Amino acid sequence: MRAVFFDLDNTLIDTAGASRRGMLEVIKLLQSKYHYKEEAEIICDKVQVKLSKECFHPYNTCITDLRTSHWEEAIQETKGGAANRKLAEECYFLWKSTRLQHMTLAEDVKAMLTELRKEVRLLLLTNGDRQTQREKIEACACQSYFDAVVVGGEQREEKPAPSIFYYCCNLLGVQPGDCVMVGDTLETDIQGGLNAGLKATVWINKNGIVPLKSSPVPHYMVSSVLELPALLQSIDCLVPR
Numbered sequence: 040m041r042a043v044f045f046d047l048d049n050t051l052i053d054t055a056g057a058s059r060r061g062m063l064e065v066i067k068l069l070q071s072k073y074h075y076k077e078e079a080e081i082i083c084d085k086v087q088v089k090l091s092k093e094c095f096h097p098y099n100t101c102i103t104d105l106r107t108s109h110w111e112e113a114i115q116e117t118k119g120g121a122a123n124r125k126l127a128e129e130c131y132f133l134w135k136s137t138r139l140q141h142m143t144l145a146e147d148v149k150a151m152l153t154e155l156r157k158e159v160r161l162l163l164l165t166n167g168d169r170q171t172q173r174e175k176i177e178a179c180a181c182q183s184y185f186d187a188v189v190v191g192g193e194q195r196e197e198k199p200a201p202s203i204f205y206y207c208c209n210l211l212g213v214q215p216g217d218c219v220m221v222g223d224t225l226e227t228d229i230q231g232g233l234n235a236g237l238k239a240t241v242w243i244n245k246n247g248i249v250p251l252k253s254s255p256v257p258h259y260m261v262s263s264v265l266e267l268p269a270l271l272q273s274i275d276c277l278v279p280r
């Protein structure tokens with residue numbers, strides 16, 4: 040038996056592009072409805088930074104309150120005035136709904152996943168807070184293409200902690216040496232698969248970059264997730280074409 044674990048964000052769905060889309064829409068809102076000028080982009084830039092700086096959480100968080108607060112702060116830090124929670128909410132929920140709407144599985148990614156599952160067990164392994172990730176999973180309707188879906192923020196530890204990989208292995212009833220991890224992030228997906236002693240790691244190198252020394256090195260590298268079947272058909276995973 041063989042299994043393939045897939046990363047989610049930016050591997051199977053365009054998360055970053057979806058987020059950019061969300062900012063584009065907020066900018067439009069602030070500029071058209073509220074007549075903001077370039078403070079629109081300034082505020083959005085601030086939120087992006089705040090988003091990027093969130094780390095902890097699992098002990099307990101209301102992500103909606105936290106991220107609404109990023110907006111509230113960014114508005115006040117840019118335009119001053121009294122804190123405006125209502126406007127913060129208007130921005131947040133526009134950004135959120137816009138991004139979730141943008142997240143979809145391309146038809147060739149759907150076909151690819153369908154083909155893989157005929158021969159191997161498929162699992163989605165995605166870092167991030169429970170609510171946000173489950174919302175993304177619902178938005179791109181991907182749960183039906185996998186035998187299981189595991190979310191880092193629902194677990195005790197996330198990628199690259201080997202524990203979450205061993206959990207995934209048990210969930211599918213396989214061993215780490217039966218498994219392949221596919222993802223676009225060296226420090227989570229690849230390091231994690233290396234930590235957990237998986238059969239192989241596949242790095243989707245979208246940026247066409249040479250890993251700086253001291254970075255994790257994957258077993259295999261592809262520029263697109265659509266290259267996976269041919270690759271897996273060559274290593275000990277899928278039968279030859």
Ligand SMILES: [Mg+2]
Nearest residue numbers: 046048049050
């Ligand atoms: Mg990713």
